Every structure is written in C-alpha cells, then in structure tokens.
Amino acid sequence: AKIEEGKLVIWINGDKGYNGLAEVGKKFEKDTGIKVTVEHPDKLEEKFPQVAATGDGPDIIFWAHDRFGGYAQSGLLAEITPAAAFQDKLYPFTWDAVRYNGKLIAYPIAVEALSLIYNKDLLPNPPKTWEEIPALDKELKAKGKSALMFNLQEPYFTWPLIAADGGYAFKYAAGKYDIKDVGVDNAGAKAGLTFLVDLIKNKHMNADTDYSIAEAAFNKGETAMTINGPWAWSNIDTSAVNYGVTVLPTFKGQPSKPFVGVLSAGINAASPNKELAKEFLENYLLTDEGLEAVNKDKPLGAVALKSYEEELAKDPRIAATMENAQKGEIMPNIPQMSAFWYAVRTAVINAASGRQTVDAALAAAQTNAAANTPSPDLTVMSIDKSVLSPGESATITTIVKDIDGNPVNEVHINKTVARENLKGLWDYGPLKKENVPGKYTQVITYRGHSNERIDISFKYAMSFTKEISIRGRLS
Amino acid sequence: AKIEEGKLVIWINGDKGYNGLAEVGKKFEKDTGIKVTVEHPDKLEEKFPQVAATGDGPDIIFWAHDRFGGYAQSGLLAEITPAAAFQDKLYPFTWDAVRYNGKLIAYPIAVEALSLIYNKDLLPNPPKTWEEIPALDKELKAKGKSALMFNLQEPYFTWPLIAADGGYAFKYAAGKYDIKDVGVDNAGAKAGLTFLVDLIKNKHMNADTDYSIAEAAFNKGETAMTINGPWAWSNIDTSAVNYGVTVLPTFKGQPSKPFVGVLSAGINAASPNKELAKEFLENYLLTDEGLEAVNKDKPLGAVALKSYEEELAKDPRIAATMENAQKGEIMPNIPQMSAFWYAVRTAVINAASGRQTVDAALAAAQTNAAANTPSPDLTVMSIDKSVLSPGESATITTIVKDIDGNPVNEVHINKTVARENLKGLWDYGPLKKENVPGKYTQVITYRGHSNERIDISFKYAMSFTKEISIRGRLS
Ligand SMILES: OC[C@H]1O[C@H](O[C@H]2[C@H](O)[C@@H](O)[C@@H](O[C@H]3[C@H](O)[C@@H](O)[C@@H](O[C@H]4[C@H](O)[C@@H](O)[C@@H](O)O[C@@H]4CO)O[C@@H]3CO)O[C@@H]2CO)[C@H](O)[C@@H](O)[C@@H]1O
Ligand SMILES: OC[C@H]1O[C@H](O[C@H]2[C@H](O)[C@@H](O)[C@@H](O[C@H]3[C@H](O)[C@@H](O)[C@@H](O[C@H]4[C@H](O)[C@@H](O)[C@@H](O)O[C@@H]4CO)O[C@@H]3CO)O[C@@H]2CO)[C@H](O)[C@@H](O)[C@@H]1O
C-alpha cells in the first residue's frame, strides 16, 4: 500500500491488465531487487489528487490522459523528459495527448476508442444506423434476445451518440479550449440524447443497464451488440461467443464520435522513487515484451510503441478501434474535463430515467460543466455551538463560493467525522441543500452517554477542507 | 450515495448478485415509491463502521456474518425482532449465525462454503487428496495445463487447508470463544501452510495468484481446478467449460474444513428508514421471487429461506456446497474475527512468498490475532512544532497502547491531511515504525511558496482519531 524509498507502488484501473502489468513488475524486481506492487483501487483517479501531495499515493498512476491536466495544474506530476531516441519510439500524437502547458506530464501507453461489438451468430450484418436499432430489437425480442446493451451509467459510453450530430465538450479556438464555451446542449447533443431516451421509453434498453449487466448479457449470447473498448475482448474470448468489432452506427448519417483516450502513466512528483519509476516505464513496460505481457491479460488497444503497434495493426479489431478513433476526437487534458464528465454523467442518468427532460438535463450540464471551482479563500463554514450538553443540537452552515465570491451551485462535499473515543452518542441529520446556491446545513444532536469531542471536516470538490469541533459534555 | 429519509441505500460486495438485488429494489420502488440504490464499494465492510455512526453509511449492509459482532458491539446495528411466523421461514442455524449477545443483529440470506471446482474434460476424476496435486500438476503441465489455481491473497481460500489437520481460530469452551486461545500456530496449521508453501517452491502454484488470475485460468480451460464459492458459478457458465463442484481434497486423510459464512443483511442503527429496510428485507428479498432474482444473477449458495432452499437442494452443486459446509465450521461472529483474518492474511502471503518461514509466520499471526485493541484513552500523538517557517521540519510521534497501557505492536494507521488552500509546498516523509512496539514517527517539511495551515489526522485501527495542526508561514 505505502510509498517508500526502494519500492514501487502502481495504481491502474481494474478493467485493465493489472495482472500482466504485475508480471512486468516481477521482471523488474528480479533484475533490481525493487518490489513492484500493482493495485487497482476503486476511484483511483479521484483518490490520487487527494493523497499524492499529502504523502500517500502511488509512485505511478495509470489513467486515460484526460485526467492529467488537472493533476499537472496542481503540481502533482513529475515532468517527463525522455531522450529523443526514446521519444521517437512512440507515435507523436500520443505525446501530444500527454503535453500540458508545454511540458510532457506522463508516458503514453495505448490508444483507446469504443467500438461496436457484435455477435456474428445472432447478427452477422450489424446495423449501419442507430435509429433502426429499435425495430431490430423488436425482431430479436421475438426470439429471446435483445439488440443492444451497454453501460449507461458512465457518460464515456453515451458520448459517441451525443457527439454524432454535433455535441461537443469545450470549443477549441486560438490554440486553446474555451472553458466557458460548452457544447453539450446544442441541437446535435439534445437529439443524440433524445434518441437514447426514446430507445429506453420504448423498452429497447433499460435505464439501469451498467457495465456488468451489459458484459454478462453479451458474453452469455443474450444481446446481439455491445459498445466497449479493447480491454473487454479477453472476457469475450473466454465466453462461447463469435464476435466482431466494427464501426459504431451512424446517427443522422453522421459517424458516432467517441472521445478517444490515451492510457497514460504519470509519476508522482512527491515520489522518492522517480528515477526507478522512469526506468520501469521506459526500460521494462514500454518494450515489445512489456506491452505484450499487459496485452495478453487485457488488450490495450492501439499501443503507443510503434514497434509493437506495427504487429497489432494487422488485427481487424485494432483496425476497427483505429477507425472509430479517427471518427472521434482525442480528449482534452484540461483540468475542466472532470467537471465536464460529472455533468454529462448526471444529465444522461437523469434523462434516461425520466427524472428530467433532455432539454433540461443538457441545459443544466452546460451550466455545471462551465462552473468555476470552489475557492478555499471565499468559502464559509461555521457551527453555531462548539460545546453541547445532552439533548442539545448544533448546526453547521457552509456557503461555497468561487474565487470571485460567487456561489457555486453544485458542489461535492465529503463529510468526515473524527472521533475522540467512540463512546458518545450522536445523531446526524442529512447534509441539507438550502434554497439558495452554494448553501448547505447539517444538524448534529449530542445524546450523551459519555463525554466526547468530535471534529467534523468538510472537503470541497475533492480539494480544500474546512473543519469545526464539538465538545460533547454530560453536565 | 447519501442516506436520507424516504430512500434506501444498500451496500453489497461486488462478487455477489448486486444487479439481481437491484431488480428486487425496482419492485419495491414500484409498489412504494421508495427508490432503492444498490452499491458495491470496495472495502465496504471496513468503510461501514467508519461511516455508519457518523451519518454516512447505507441503510442496509450485506456481508458474511463474521463481521457483524464487531458492528453490534459498537452499536451500529438495529436489533432485528421479526415475528415468529417469519423466523420460522428460515433455518434455525442461520439465525444462530446472526445472534450476538442474545440479540438478532441481521437477517440471514444464504449459506456459503468453498468447494473444489473442476474441469470435467481435463480432469473428470478430481483428486482425493491435496498432496498428490503436485504430481498431477506435473502431468498437466506436460500438456499445457496446470492442476490448480485459487486466490492466495485472501485467507478465506487457504483456511480450509490450514484447518484440515487441526488449525483453529479461537478455542470454543464454556459457551464462548476464548479470544486469547488462538489455534493458527498449532502442528496441524503449520503443516497445512507448509504444504501450500511447498506447492509454490515446487512451481505448482504461484505465490502471486489472486482471484482474477485464478478465475481467468479456470474459465479459459487452462487450469483443471479452482477453489471458489457459489457466486463464481455464473461466470463459469458463461465460459465454454464443463465443470463439476465437489468435496475439497483431504489433507493427512482429514477433510478440508472451510470457514462457513452466512451472507447477512444488517440495518444501520442510525438509518431514518429502519422500518422501510425491514419491509424490503422481509417482504421483498426474503421471498422465493426475491432470492430467485439475486440467485439468477450470481448464485447465493444454500439459501436461508426453507421454501426456496428445498428447490435449490436438488442441484448437485448445492449438495456439494452443503457437504463442504458440514465438514467445516460456521465462522464466529465475535469482534475479534477481523483481527484473526488480518493476521492470517499476512502469514499466508509472507510465507507463500518466502518473506518468512511457516513456523515464524504462524507464530506471529497468533500474537496479532490475540492482541488487544488500541485504546483512545492511552494512545499518544504529538508534534514537536505547531508553526513552521520555510525549510523547517516538524515530527509527529505517536505511541499506540491498549486499555491497560500496553503497546500494540502492529497497528493500522490511516493518515489524512486536510489542507487550507493547496498553495503551500510540503514534503512528507514515510510513517516510520520505530524500534519499540507501538511507536511511529513522521517528518513533515514546510517548503514555503504560500502560507497554509494543514491538519493531520491519524485514525487508529479504523476506530478513533487523533489530530495535530501545523501553521506554515513564510516569514
Ligand atoms: O460520482 C460519479 C463517479 O465519479 C467518478 O467517475 C468520474 C471520473 O472521476 C472522471 O474522471 C470521469 O471519468 C471519465 C474518464 O476520466 C475518461 O477517461 C473515460 O473513462 C473511460 C476510460 O478512458 C476507459 O479506459 C475505460 O476505463 O472506461 C472508462 C469509462 O468508465 O470516461 C469517464 C466518464 O465515463 O467521469 C467519471 C464520472 O462519469 C468515480 O470513479 C465513480 O465511481 C463515480 O460514480
Ligand atoms: O488490508 C487487507 C485487506 O483488508 C480488507 O479485507 C479483510 C476484511 O475486512 C475482513 O473482514 C476479513 O475478510 C474475511 C471476511 O470477513 C469473510 O467473510 C471471508 O470473506 C469471503 C466471503 O465470506 C465470501 O462471500 C466471498 O466474498 O469471499 C470472501 C473472501 O475474499 O473471508 C475474508 C478473509 O479472506 O479479512 C480481510 C483480509 O483478508 C479489505 O477488504 C481488503 O481490500 C484488504 O486488502
């Protein structure tokens, strides 16, 4: 778990070839004596910024490149400066993905795009268009099958459809992304989303479909199609299914336009093992043998390493991946990407479920994606009472504001309570959103039993913290 | 995510039928208007006690019953008092598993035991004994296969072997478990472990084998045998494999003796939805239809509900589960179970890898399993400096002690740093174990850039917290 001199800790997502990566680690250990521990914590991409600067992260973090600009802006990443000879071993466009403010911030590993994955026995002539899928589903349902299942809970999987007829994240102009010019609520985006929503209302898909439901349904031969990336191919191979990987369907005659990720490896700026990390990545992983070991576990996609990619490129599944990639767009790496994703995630889910209209959902995503970040300097937190007797209550009031002093309407707040002794009895109300932007309250009732101090910390937007204390006394 | 009046949040492990459970939730929602959100956080069993009492848990927690005594001791669980008619619908021994200090603390759902799962094409006559497996592996390796792969990283999977020839957790006598009488280092336990270790050294298994490696190897037809529970059967069915589920091999002519878990559902004492939770569990889940929906996703094992179990019991896989269960032991539910597991986990891993001898590994597990818990009242935490100028360092010293004032040698300490502004530059050393029991130090160097206050909290044994603060000032 712990970062220490002389050992390497690596975090990679649980859908990737972590076992194969650990094999590369074993080889490094054999040669160097340096143990390499590969972990796949949930929410690693959220945890990393919280722990990296405060002494508790991995030495190396793997994620798609979209997360890395935010990390770099915060100073969390070592600058990557490989020799020209090494740089020349990887595709130039992959280095571009991991460049932030003129500096290389990670090593590129592999290029990922979603494709249409289809069952050749059920559906050897997969549809050209999205909009026929409902009629197709009707046909399949009459023989115990469904047309299509994919993960509706992650916006990555729905974006290609939202983008097909013109939806965009941030407008690109004059050498940069305009962080206030968000394209999620344009005509093209509302449509794509509407379409999905109609698929649902018409009982072709289920709003609750997640990664595991879709994977199981495809791999068991129950659904004719899924939308997934190269990492998914291994489990399909394990199954009995004869599958193809192809171009995503069109929408309004336009290609679906997936957001393309470059799986990337960053080095923690606070690591005492930066040089070892670089050696591991450059000399062990980013080799034919190293990438093969990871790929054999879960396929990587179109790898960044030219020598190995030249071999993979022959695979029709890879050719299809690259085709879909070329029809989409390489994700920005800017800090605002997470805000964009969080916003779109909420809009797809809310709409799919009919908890809001498409017009409304997407209008709101636009606001939230473009929102300023909370400022520690202007955010307020107080409690009305710092000592409680049994039966007394204290209320926390917090008001979250940006750098300009303007409220931030939607904010992630993580509450943590530190307890002196675990002997006192306490009741916590919900964190209540009040009827003005940025304002939340929480009621805490001391019920006695034992004297106990508690310290309540609110972490805002997975960044800064404010804290209050309560002394519970029996008298 | 959040606990709120009028909605249900459920936590269940990611290896269980969470999608099927969500289906039961949908039915409840249809009837009642109460949304049911099923989550599968990693480490849910560790998180639950940390958040349940402090206003941030689920309404309902699912885990095997072994975890629940600790939760109950801490006051985290609502007492369960179903009508006699309802009680009579479930097997008596399952209620016994969820009784703590004379009170029912959860609803029993299903009985789980590990079995030997084997590939009928590769190995239709699976071995009787463990000790022949190495020779068998030799035969299989000569035809591109291995004999056996199972999760070595979780002690649950190795326990049946450790226990076969007499290993035990806590001695049971006079109506109770003796928490100071730990059986992990007896002759029978050292042997079983030694055997596994020899399997490894002789290249029959790999010390690094985890759940996913083993699952993939079995399901792809690469390994003849695995050790797993009923939840695993779904993915095997998806694969091409013809498999059987049978009695675990013997060791020294003794049955392997798995620790048997009762998957159980507890209600958070702090839930404002206790009655809804009870209705969901009693009236929706613990019905033929409800359990079927979960079972169809991932098999539950031998369910607690007699009416449904009578149907399942016909399944030879269930018969085998029950056979292995009867050869093992129902886990204690006492608070000390987690300490036991943590200890055995470290001993298996350390030994399997050859980082310690079996004799040593198991001697140490014994000490740690029997150890007193840290006391908030006697644990020390201080920092030598509470204000720093740039280039100055402060050192935290903590000394962890039990209720009696005795040091606790091994302690889990989770460090969290709350940051005022994220503008200061700080360097954190490792948390250093000093050369006497219970004592740890950490060096923090302020590097300037900006004035910033940080608050550093140490949480001990996932229980109490102590905190210090540092004001970093440029002057
Ligand atoms: O509370 C909501 C959820 O929040 C967390 O998920 C967030 C991430 O933190 C964001 O970074 C973002 O995720 C993007 C991701 O950055 C992007 O690369 C892409 O992810 C693909 C990935 O490239 C691919 O290799 C493979 O792993 O599939 C991923 C998709 O699942 O797309 C993501 C958006 O879908 O936004 C999400 C929220 O949507 C947290 O992890 C969740 O547990 C939490 O529910
Ligand atoms: O830091 C080490 C690891 O710590 C955490 O794992 C702990 C758990 O918190 C403990 O409760 C215990 O786990 C037992 C578990 O309580 C017991 O029921 C059994 O679990 C079976 C389960 O019954 C079955 O249904 C299925 O899910 O498989 C489980 C086994 O994986 O056995 C467990 C012990 O193997 O001890 C473990 C540590 O071993 C934390 O979750 C980990 O992430 C962490 O690495």
Short mmCIF file of N, CA and C in Angstrom, two decimals, chain A residues 3-4 18-19 26 40-42 47 50 53-56 74 206 208 210 212-213 216 219-220 234-235 237-240 270 297 376-377 415 417-423 426-430 442 455 457 459 463-467, chain B residues 3-4 18-19 26 40-42 47 50 53-56 74 206 208 210 212-213 216 219-220 234-235 237-240 270 297 376-377 415 417-423 426-430 442 455 457 459 463-467:
data_model
loop_
_atom_site.label_atom_id
_atom_site.label_comp_id
_atom_site.label_asym_id
_atom_site.label_seq_id
_atom_site.Cartn_x
_atom_site.Cartn_y
_atom_site.Cartn_z
N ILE A 3 3.86 4.21 0.01
CA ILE A 3 5.02 4.84 -0.69
C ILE A 3 6.21 4.86 0.26
N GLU A 4 7.27 4.25 -0.23
CA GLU A 4 8.56 4.21 0.49
C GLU A 4 9.73 4.10 -0.49
N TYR A 18 -3.97 -5.52 -15.13
CA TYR A 18 -3.16 -5.31 -13.94
C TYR A 18 -2.31 -6.53 -13.56
N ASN A 19 -2.82 -7.71 -13.84
CA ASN A 19 -2.05 -8.92 -13.60
C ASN A 19 -0.85 -9.03 -14.54
N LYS A 26 7.43 -8.08 -11.84
CA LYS A 26 8.25 -9.19 -11.33
C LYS A 26 9.61 -9.26 -11.98
N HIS A 40 -5.34 -1.73 -7.81
CA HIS A 40 -6.46 -1.20 -8.61
C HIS A 40 -7.59 -0.68 -7.73
N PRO A 41 -7.31 0.35 -6.90
CA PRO A 41 -8.32 0.85 -6.04
C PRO A 41 -9.48 1.39 -6.82
N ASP A 42 -10.67 1.28 -6.25
CA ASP A 42 -11.78 1.97 -6.90
C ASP A 42 -11.54 3.49 -6.75
N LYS A 47 -8.93 9.55 -5.94
CA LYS A 47 -8.08 9.42 -4.74
C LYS A 47 -6.70 10.04 -4.97
N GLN A 50 -5.88 13.50 -4.06
CA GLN A 50 -6.12 13.75 -2.63
C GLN A 50 -4.97 13.30 -1.75
N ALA A 53 -0.09 14.53 -2.96
CA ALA A 53 0.65 15.71 -2.44
C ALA A 53 0.83 15.66 -0.91
N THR A 54 0.07 14.78 -0.29
CA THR A 54 0.00 14.64 1.18
C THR A 54 0.67 13.39 1.71
N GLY A 55 1.52 12.84 0.88
CA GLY A 55 2.43 11.70 1.22
C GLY A 55 1.93 10.27 1.11
N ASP A 56 0.83 10.06 0.40
CA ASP A 56 0.07 8.73 0.44
C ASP A 56 -0.41 8.08 -0.86
N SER A 74 -2.12 21.15 -10.48
CA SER A 74 -1.93 21.06 -9.01
C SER A 74 -0.53 20.73 -8.55
N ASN A 206 -32.76 -0.58 -21.10
CA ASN A 206 -33.15 -0.33 -19.70
C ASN A 206 -32.23 0.75 -19.11
N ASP A 208 -31.25 1.38 -16.30
CA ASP A 208 -30.37 0.85 -15.21
C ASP A 208 -29.18 0.02 -15.72
N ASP A 210 -25.81 -1.25 -16.63
CA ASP A 210 -24.45 -0.89 -16.20
C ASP A 210 -23.41 -1.78 -16.93
N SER A 212 -21.57 -4.29 -15.87
CA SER A 212 -21.65 -5.73 -15.61
C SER A 212 -22.89 -6.37 -16.28
N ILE A 213 -24.02 -5.70 -16.23
CA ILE A 213 -25.23 -6.21 -16.88
C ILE A 213 -24.92 -6.38 -18.37
N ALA A 216 -22.27 -9.24 -19.12
CA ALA A 216 -22.91 -10.55 -18.94
C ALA A 216 -23.87 -10.90 -20.08
N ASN A 219 -21.81 -11.57 -23.30
CA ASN A 219 -20.91 -12.70 -23.22
C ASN A 219 -21.70 -14.04 -23.11
N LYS A 220 -22.92 -13.96 -22.59
CA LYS A 220 -23.84 -15.10 -22.50
C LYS A 220 -24.66 -15.31 -23.78
N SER A 234 -10.96 -9.83 -23.90
CA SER A 234 -10.47 -11.04 -23.19
C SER A 234 -11.62 -11.86 -22.65
N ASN A 235 -12.53 -11.17 -21.97
CA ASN A 235 -13.67 -11.89 -21.36
C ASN A 235 -14.59 -12.45 -22.46
N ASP A 237 -13.53 -13.52 -25.33
CA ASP A 237 -12.81 -14.72 -25.81
C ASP A 237 -13.05 -15.93 -24.90
N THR A 238 -13.12 -15.68 -23.61
CA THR A 238 -13.40 -16.74 -22.59
C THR A 238 -14.79 -17.36 -22.79
N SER A 239 -15.71 -16.53 -23.24
CA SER A 239 -17.09 -16.94 -23.47
C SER A 239 -17.17 -17.82 -24.71
N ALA A 240 -18.37 -18.33 -24.99
CA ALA A 240 -18.52 -19.10 -26.24
C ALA A 240 -18.73 -18.27 -27.56
N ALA A 270 5.95 13.71 -5.80
CA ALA A 270 6.38 13.51 -4.40
C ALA A 270 6.98 12.12 -4.14
N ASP A 297 -3.06 -10.12 -21.00
CA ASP A 297 -4.03 -10.10 -19.89
C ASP A 297 -5.36 -9.47 -20.34
N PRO A 376 -10.99 28.12 -1.65
CA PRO A 376 -10.88 27.99 -0.21
C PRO A 376 -10.97 29.33 0.46
N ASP A 377 -10.52 30.33 -0.27
CA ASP A 377 -10.38 31.69 0.29
C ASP A 377 -11.70 32.38 0.53
N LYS A 415 -18.03 14.81 3.85
CA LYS A 415 -18.02 14.88 5.34
C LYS A 415 -17.28 13.72 6.04
N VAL A 417 -15.99 12.59 9.96
CA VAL A 417 -16.03 12.82 11.41
C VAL A 417 -14.96 12.01 12.10
N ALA A 418 -14.09 12.75 12.76
CA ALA A 418 -13.09 12.18 13.63
C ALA A 418 -13.58 12.15 15.05
N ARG A 419 -13.46 11.00 15.65
CA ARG A 419 -13.99 10.74 16.98
C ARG A 419 -12.91 10.49 18.00
N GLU A 420 -13.03 11.20 19.10
CA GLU A 420 -12.08 11.07 20.22
C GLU A 420 -12.09 9.67 20.85
N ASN A 421 -13.26 9.13 21.10
CA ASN A 421 -13.36 7.88 21.90
C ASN A 421 -14.40 6.84 21.50
N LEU A 422 -15.30 7.20 20.61
CA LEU A 422 -16.40 6.33 20.14
C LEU A 422 -17.41 5.98 21.24
N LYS A 423 -17.38 6.68 22.35
CA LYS A 423 -18.27 6.41 23.48
C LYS A 423 -19.49 7.31 23.52
N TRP A 426 -24.36 10.26 19.32
CA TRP A 426 -24.63 11.36 18.40
C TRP A 426 -25.61 11.00 17.34
N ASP A 427 -26.38 11.98 16.92
CA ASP A 427 -27.32 11.86 15.83
C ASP A 427 -26.92 12.92 14.81
N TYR A 428 -26.82 12.50 13.57
CA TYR A 428 -26.52 13.37 12.42
C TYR A 428 -27.71 13.44 11.49
N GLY A 429 -28.12 14.65 11.21
CA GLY A 429 -29.08 14.89 10.16
C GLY A 429 -28.39 14.77 8.80
N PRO A 430 -29.17 14.84 7.72
CA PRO A 430 -28.60 14.89 6.41
C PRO A 430 -27.89 16.20 6.17
N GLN A 442 -26.16 21.24 8.28
CA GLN A 442 -26.21 19.93 8.89
C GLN A 442 -26.41 20.05 10.36
N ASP A 455 -14.54 16.06 15.66
CA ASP A 455 -14.03 17.07 14.74
C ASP A 455 -14.61 16.70 13.38
N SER A 457 -14.98 17.52 9.48
CA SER A 457 -14.30 18.13 8.37
C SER A 457 -15.14 17.98 7.10
N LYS A 459 -14.70 18.41 3.09
CA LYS A 459 -13.80 18.54 1.94
C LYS A 459 -14.64 18.92 0.73
N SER A 463 -10.86 18.90 -2.96
CA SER A 463 -9.74 19.84 -2.86
C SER A 463 -9.46 20.26 -1.40
N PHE A 464 -9.90 21.45 -1.04
CA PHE A 464 -9.62 22.02 0.27
C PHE A 464 -10.58 21.50 1.32
N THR A 465 -10.21 21.66 2.59
CA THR A 465 -11.04 21.25 3.73
C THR A 465 -11.22 22.40 4.68
N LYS A 466 -12.40 22.42 5.29
CA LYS A 466 -12.67 23.28 6.47
C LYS A 466 -13.18 22.38 7.58
N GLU A 467 -12.92 22.77 8.79
CA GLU A 467 -13.17 21.90 9.93
C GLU A 467 -13.78 22.68 11.06
N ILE B 3 -27.50 8.70 2.55
CA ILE B 3 -28.60 8.31 3.48
C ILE B 3 -29.53 9.51 3.66
N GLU B 4 -30.78 9.25 3.34
CA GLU B 4 -31.86 10.24 3.51
C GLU B 4 -33.20 9.55 3.74
N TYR B 18 -25.50 -8.19 -7.22
CA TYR B 18 -25.97 -6.84 -6.95
C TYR B 18 -26.98 -6.34 -7.99
N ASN B 19 -26.82 -6.77 -9.22
CA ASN B 19 -27.77 -6.41 -10.26
C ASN B 19 -29.14 -7.05 -10.02
N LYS B 26 -36.21 -2.50 -7.57
CA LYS B 26 -37.14 -1.86 -8.53
C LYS B 26 -38.59 -2.18 -8.25
N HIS B 40 -21.78 -1.23 -4.48
CA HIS B 40 -20.77 -2.25 -4.14
C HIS B 40 -19.39 -1.63 -3.95
N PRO B 41 -19.24 -0.72 -2.96
CA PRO B 41 -17.98 -0.09 -2.77
C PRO B 41 -16.92 -1.09 -2.43
N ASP B 42 -15.70 -0.81 -2.83
CA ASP B 42 -14.62 -1.67 -2.34
C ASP B 42 -14.47 -1.41 -0.83
N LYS B 47 -15.40 0.21 5.56
CA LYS B 47 -15.97 1.58 5.50
C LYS B 47 -17.20 1.69 6.42
N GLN B 50 -17.00 2.90 9.88
CA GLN B 50 -16.40 4.25 9.94
C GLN B 50 -17.41 5.34 9.67
N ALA B 53 -22.02 5.33 12.01
CA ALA B 53 -22.35 6.06 13.28
C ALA B 53 -22.21 7.58 13.13
N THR B 54 -21.55 7.97 12.06
CA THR B 54 -21.20 9.39 11.77
C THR B 54 -22.00 10.01 10.65
N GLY B 55 -23.12 9.36 10.37
CA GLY B 55 -24.17 9.86 9.43
C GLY B 55 -24.05 9.58 7.93
N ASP B 56 -23.20 8.63 7.56
CA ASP B 56 -22.78 8.44 6.10
C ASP B 56 -22.74 7.04 5.48
N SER B 74 -20.19 -2.18 18.71
CA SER B 74 -20.07 -0.71 18.52
C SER B 74 -21.39 0.05 18.45
N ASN B 206 1.70 -20.37 -8.02
CA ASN B 206 2.42 -19.09 -7.98
C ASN B 206 1.92 -18.26 -6.79
N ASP B 208 1.73 -15.28 -6.22
CA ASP B 208 1.01 -14.04 -6.65
C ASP B 208 -0.42 -14.30 -7.15
N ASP B 210 -4.11 -14.46 -7.59
CA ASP B 210 -5.22 -13.72 -6.99
C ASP B 210 -6.56 -14.23 -7.56
N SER B 212 -8.67 -12.88 -9.71
CA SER B 212 -8.86 -12.71 -11.16
C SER B 212 -7.97 -13.66 -11.98
N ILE B 213 -6.73 -13.85 -11.57
CA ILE B 213 -5.84 -14.77 -12.27
C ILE B 213 -6.49 -16.16 -12.23
N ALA B 216 -9.81 -16.40 -14.38
CA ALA B 216 -9.47 -16.42 -15.81
C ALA B 216 -8.89 -17.77 -16.25
N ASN B 219 -11.67 -20.45 -16.17
CA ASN B 219 -12.78 -20.22 -17.09
C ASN B 219 -12.30 -20.35 -18.57
N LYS B 220 -11.02 -20.12 -18.79
CA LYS B 220 -10.39 -20.28 -20.11
C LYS B 220 -9.93 -21.72 -20.38
N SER B 234 -21.71 -18.50 -12.11
CA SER B 234 -22.31 -17.74 -13.25
C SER B 234 -21.29 -17.51 -14.34
N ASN B 235 -20.12 -17.03 -13.92
CA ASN B 235 -19.07 -16.73 -14.92
C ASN B 235 -18.56 -18.03 -15.57
N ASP B 237 -20.42 -20.63 -16.12
CA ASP B 237 -21.49 -20.97 -17.09
C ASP B 237 -21.33 -20.20 -18.41
N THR B 238 -20.93 -18.94 -18.29
CA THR B 238 -20.69 -18.06 -19.47
C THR B 238 -19.56 -18.60 -20.36
N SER B 239 -18.59 -19.21 -19.70
CA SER B 239 -17.43 -19.76 -20.37
C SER B 239 -17.81 -21.02 -21.14
N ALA B 240 -16.85 -21.58 -21.86
CA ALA B 240 -17.15 -22.87 -22.53
C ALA B 240 -17.04 -24.17 -21.65
N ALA B 270 -28.56 3.91 12.77
CA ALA B 270 -28.71 5.37 12.53
C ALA B 270 -29.54 5.70 11.29
N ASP B 297 -28.67 -13.89 -10.97
CA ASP B 297 -27.50 -13.03 -11.26
C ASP B 297 -26.20 -13.74 -10.89
N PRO B 376 -8.29 4.66 22.80
CA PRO B 376 -8.12 6.08 22.56
C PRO B 376 -7.58 6.77 23.79
N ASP B 377 -7.94 6.21 24.92
CA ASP B 377 -7.64 6.83 26.22
C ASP B 377 -6.18 6.79 26.59
N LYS B 415 -3.46 7.87 7.85
CA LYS B 415 -3.14 9.33 7.78
C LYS B 415 -3.96 10.14 6.75
N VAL B 417 -4.61 14.20 5.57
CA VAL B 417 -4.20 15.61 5.66
C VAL B 417 -5.26 16.49 5.03
N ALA B 418 -5.77 17.36 5.88
CA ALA B 418 -6.68 18.41 5.46
C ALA B 418 -5.91 19.68 5.20
N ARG B 419 -6.16 20.24 4.05
CA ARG B 419 -5.43 21.41 3.57
C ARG B 419 -6.30 22.63 3.46
N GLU B 420 -5.79 23.71 4.03
CA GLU B 420 -6.48 25.01 4.00
C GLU B 420 -6.66 25.56 2.58
N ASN B 421 -5.61 25.52 1.79
CA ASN B 421 -5.63 26.22 0.48
C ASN B 421 -4.96 25.55 -0.72
N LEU B 422 -4.22 24.49 -0.48
CA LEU B 422 -3.47 23.75 -1.52
C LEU B 422 -2.36 24.58 -2.18
N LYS B 423 -1.99 25.70 -1.59
CA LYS B 423 -0.97 26.58 -2.14
C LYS B 423 0.41 26.38 -1.53
N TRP B 426 4.81 21.30 0.67
CA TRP B 426 5.12 20.39 1.77
C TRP B 426 5.75 19.12 1.31
N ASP B 427 6.61 18.57 2.14
CA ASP B 427 7.24 17.29 1.92
C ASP B 427 6.89 16.43 3.12
N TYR B 428 6.43 15.23 2.85
CA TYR B 428 6.10 14.22 3.87
C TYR B 428 7.05 13.05 3.76
N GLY B 429 7.65 12.73 4.88
CA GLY B 429 8.40 11.50 5.00
C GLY B 429 7.42 10.33 5.15
N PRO B 430 7.95 9.11 5.15
CA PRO B 430 7.14 7.96 5.44
C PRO B 430 6.71 7.94 6.89
N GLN B 442 6.67 10.58 11.97
CA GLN B 442 6.55 11.12 10.63
C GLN B 442 7.08 12.51 10.57
N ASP B 455 -3.98 20.22 8.74
CA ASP B 455 -4.43 19.47 9.92
C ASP B 455 -4.25 18.00 9.55
N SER B 457 -4.54 14.16 10.62
CA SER B 457 -5.29 13.25 11.47
C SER B 457 -4.80 11.82 11.25
N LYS B 459 -5.97 8.04 12.13
CA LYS B 459 -7.04 7.13 12.55
C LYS B 459 -6.41 5.78 12.85
N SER B 463 -10.80 3.05 13.97
CA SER B 463 -11.63 3.45 15.11
C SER B 463 -11.48 4.94 15.45
N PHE B 464 -10.71 5.24 16.48
CA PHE B 464 -10.58 6.60 16.98
C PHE B 464 -9.55 7.39 16.18
N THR B 465 -9.60 8.71 16.30
CA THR B 465 -8.66 9.61 15.61
C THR B 465 -8.02 10.54 16.61
N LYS B 466 -6.77 10.87 16.33
CA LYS B 466 -6.07 11.99 16.99
C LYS B 466 -5.55 12.91 15.91
N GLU B 467 -5.45 14.17 16.24
CA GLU B 467 -5.17 15.18 15.23
C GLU B 467 -4.17 16.17 15.76
#
